[PDB]
Design a protein around this ligand. Structure first.
Ligand SMILES: CC(=O)N[C@H]1[C@@H](OP(=O)(O)OP(=O)(O)OC[C@H]2O[C@@H](n3ccc(=O)[nH]c3=O)[C@H](O)[C@@H]2O)O[C@H](CO)[C@@H](O)[C@@H]1O[C@H](C)C(=O)O
Length: 242
């Protein structure tokens, strides 16, 4: 349909979905289910696309949209309204509360515990992934990392994610083993954002990791991609306790 449903061993109390570009009202280059409000689209179309996602996903409440800044801060969803939503991840243990991250190449990661009593969503672009957003998201859970599941959503894969030293140096400063995930490609590198996520998740003891098969740049019928399109829309990934 419009929506991707993560293929992971989802506990009964957990629901998740990840949007695609299909099924909205936005015009090119935002065509069509653009959920992002700061990328130059018509605000009335973004509002309608967000309502369509709400209906298609059977969400129990409106998603808690974050003021994403490519950092490592996590908002605990203790109840609307919020003083500040300046964060790149959210955490919930409240039934019906919808965690949401907005992406167009950055890695969305969805998290839940085996008990299906706590969920989280993280926006892991290269800058936030390097800074520790995933480790910070795991640290918000009451449960131990051995009992946490992670789903790697659609991101820019290593076929397409060309980077320079701004990026490789940053990662090698935090954890030298990141070098494996950078492959020389002329004067630049191809970076494997899924590998870097798997490193950071293993570092905090998250072992049960799913997804990581999609490519936002390559699969242009399905996804917006900042790197491919420059001016483009945003998908989002969603998780909640039923
Ligand atoms: C995957 C990811 O983190 N993408 C993010 C990143 O874009 P990116 O595309 O990486 O741009 P760069 O940071 O400016 O550059 C990162 C590195 O990549 C080199 N490069 C860039 C372009 C190119 O063609 N070739 C090339 O080698 C460049 O020299 C630098 O070393 O930075 C943008 C903000 O500037 C974000 O909006 C974007 O977030 C997305 C939307 C989201 O939230 O989903």
């Amino acid at each position: 349909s419009k929506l991707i449903v993560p293929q992971w061993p989802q506990p009964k109390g957990v629901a998740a979905c990840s949007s695609t570009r299909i099924g909205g009202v936005s015009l090119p280059p935002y065509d069509s289910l653009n959920l992002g409000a700061h990328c130059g689209d018509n605000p009335d179309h973004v509002e309608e696309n967000r309502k369509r996602l709400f209906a298609a996903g059977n969400l129990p409440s409106k998603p808690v949209w974050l003021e994403q800044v490519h950092g490592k801060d996590v908002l605990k969803l203790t109840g609307e309204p919020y003083a500040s939503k300046r964060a790149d991840a959210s955490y919930s243990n409240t039934p019906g509360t919808v965690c949401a991250v907005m992406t167009a190449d950055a890695l969305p990661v969805l998290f839940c515990n085996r008990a299906g009593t706590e969920v989280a969503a993280a926006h892991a672009g290269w800058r936030g992934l390097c800074a520790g957003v995933l480790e910070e998201t795991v640290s918000c859970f009451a449960d131990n990392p051995e009992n946490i599941l992670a789903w790697l959503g659609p991101a820019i894969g290593p076929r397409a994610f060309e980077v320079g030293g701004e990026v490789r140096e940053a990662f090698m400063a935090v954890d030298a083993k990141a070098s494996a995930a950078f492959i020389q490609h002329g004067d630049k590198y191809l970076a494997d954002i899924y590998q870097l996520a798997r490193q950071r998740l293993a570092n905090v003891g998250v072992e049960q990791i799913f997804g990581g098969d999609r490519c936002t740049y390559t699969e242009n019928e399905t996804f917006f991609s900042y790197r491919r399109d420059k001016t483009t829309g945003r998908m989002a990934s969603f998780i909640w306790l039923i």
